[PDB]
Amino acid sequence: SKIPIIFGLINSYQIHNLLEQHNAKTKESKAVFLIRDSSTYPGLLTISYYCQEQDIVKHIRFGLTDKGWKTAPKPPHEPLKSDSPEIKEKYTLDKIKFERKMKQFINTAKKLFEQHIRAESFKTLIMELKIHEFNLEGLIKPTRSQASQEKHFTDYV
Ligand SMILES: N[C@@H](Cc1ccc(OP(=O)(O)O)cc1)C(=O)O
Numbered sequence: 320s321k322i323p324i325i326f327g328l329i330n331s332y333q334i335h336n337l338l339e340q341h342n343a344k345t346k347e348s349k350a351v352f353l354i355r356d357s358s359t360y361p362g363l364l365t366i367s368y369y370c371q372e373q374d375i376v377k378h379i380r381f382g383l384t385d386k387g388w389k390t391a392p393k394p395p396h397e398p399l400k401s402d403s404p405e406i407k408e409k410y411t412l413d414k415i416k417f418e419r420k421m422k423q424f425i426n427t428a429k430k431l432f433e434q435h436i437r438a439e440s441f442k443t444l445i446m447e448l449k450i451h452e453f454n455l456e457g458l459i460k461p462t463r464s465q466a467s468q469e470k471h472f473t474d475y476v
Pocket residue numbers: 356357358359360364365377378379380393394395
């Protein structure tokens with residue numbers, strides 16, 4: 320009857336309210352966090368947490384590699400209406416780079432996501448959270464109705 324510790328596809332409003340409910344805004348950055356299905360890249364996981372320094376929710380994507388869960392390629396900074404041509408020119412190269420890296424990354428991550436549903440992959444997720452310095456005590460646990468339906472996480476309890 321155990322509930323996975325991974326959230327399914329939850330919306331941005333709900334992400335913010337879950338972090339606030341668990342007092343993320345009176346605790347250090349990453350002391351409170353949740354783990355959820357990536358909405359953009361199926362097979363990836365996204366860690367959402369509160370950044371005290373910028374007063375915003377931030378998100379970090381992880382994917383399966385042969386070594387276990389690892390950080391996914393990070394996208395460039397979003398375009399802004401004030402961007403100079405120099406910013407825009409750099410964005411072009413960085414986006415192409417991100418797209419090529421992410422494509423290779425998901426090609427491997429999605430295959431591992433599919434083959435090993437009965438998985439010792441769970442321990443490597445805990446390892447990568449520790450490397451990122453997420454306080455494991457501050458993990459927000461989904462309720463049954465909000466937990467991920469993906470079979471890879473059935474035993475992520
Ligand atoms: N905000 C992140 C990118 C990001 C955005 C959304 C996100 O969630 P999802 O996987 O559901 O798209 C994860 C990561 C960054 O700029 O590095």
